[PDB]
């Protein structure tokens with residue numbers, strides 16, 4: 426595996442260069458929003474983002490060393506967590522608003538157009554303000570998003586050798602985070618404290634994914650077939 | 661100001677160890693009803709001791725009552741689960757619910773839909789065992805769950821206490837002889853497992869508020885009602 | 889209101 | 899063969 430031969434700087438460069446683009450929605454400002462149309466917008470957006478996410482995952486160091494079966498399992502478990510952390514990141518500098526797309530910036534009052542979604546909106550908004558207070562950096566963000574991919578399904582997989590490689594890669598990402606913080610001038614105590622603060626946020630991102638997923642496979646009761654398969658993997 | 665922030669790392673460890681709740685027993689071939697009865701009754705008695713334990717976590721008493729309630733409502737099943745996983749560490753393949761209630765995944769199949777949670781719990785226990793999780797680390801992780809799981813659904817005092825617990829965990833690893841790199845690597849490994857514990861609690865909670873069978877107490881019912 | 893209230897004060 | 903499987907397989 427070449428992933429374990431990367432220096433810390435080379436890891437950040439690999440992750441930064443692999444970043445997916447920020448997509449636009451079909452939001453027509455003149456069309457009055459409804460529950461159906463707003464969910465339409467979020468669903469269309471997420472579906473297009475999934476294609477980029479899949480090709481981004483191939484470029485996370487270590488990921489393509491896994492079997493295809495394992496790659497499928499990690500993406501099925503982590504996809505909404507990954508969409509959510511991206512949303513929270515690009516929303517950092519828009520207090521009280523979620524930047525779903527450059528042309529789709531929503532506050533919580535508009536999230537009430539979909540009954541039951543405002544609770545998730547508030548949690549996303551709170552995570553975004555948390556990042557803003559911490560002044561999360563772009564290099565730290567891409568590390569965290571890669572941790573989510575490799576971590577979120579590794580406990581629901583003859584073959585421990587696959588789980589061992591993922592852990593060696595996850596350890597390499599920890600070294601890279603610490604490396605970023607040491608270059609930022611943080612002390613040793615500050616480095617370990619910030620590292621903990623960042624990983625604890627992953628617990629709230631897991632929580633939001635689970636709560637959101639729960640509502641998505643009740644909203645089932647226009648989506649594309651990939652997202653439907655992604656959604657069904659949680660049932 | 662809070663007294664918890666002046667504690668040294670040895671003082672934090674000893675206080676958390678001393679706050680540990682007792683190990684409880686269950687009643688002395690399981691159906692689905694009898695299985696859920698035993699677990700519900702055991703969880704109900706454990707909740708009372710968990711609240712006492714929470715009052716003794718440094719910094720928890722400095723929060724308002726509203727904030728104490730929110731954290732315990734958010735975290736109670738996570739806290740039961742890490743306790744169970746910890747006790748089961750030395751019993752590979754089995755969940756030690758009580759000293760007289762040690763179960764395998766086959767017995768988990770008696771309740772439709774629990775075997776999935778059982779397997780996740782077993783996996784976490786074996787992960788802790790392979791990591792050689794020490795009891796001092798365990799009480800730190802369990803206190804982190806209490807203070808962290810609801811902090812973002814309300815904050816500054818809580819994050820200062822969480823930092824103190826990070827310092828304490830690193831101190832424990834340094835004392836255990838780990839290098840700098842091994843210290844932060846282990847810290848991350850343990851904190852990432854907390855994300856899986858959140859996932860188990862969420863999936864378990866989803867089932868608990870679908871089956872409304874066994875005589876769950878009113879406290880346990882209000883604790884479950886907070887997640888609906 | 890909540891049994892959790894009494895248990896946190898006793 | 900899931901859609902995600904094929905897309906991960908594409909080259």
Ligand SMILES: O=C(O)CCCCCCOc1ccc(C2=C(c3ccc(O)cc3)[C@@H]3C[C@@H](S(=O)(=O)Oc4ccc(Br)cc4)[C@H]2O3)cc1
Pocket residue numbers: 467468470471474508509511512539540541542545546633636637638640641644645646647648652653656
């Ligand atoms: O089978 C059929 O017939 C169709 C059924 C399948 C449709 C799949 C939709 O697919 C999706 C629909 C909505 C989203 C969303 C987001 C998102 C999108 C892009 C992005 O980059 C980041 C976040 C953000 C965060 C989630 S969320 O947790 O709020 O969901 C919620 C939560 C509560 C409610 Br009530 C509704 C949605 C939602 O808002 C995600 C997927």
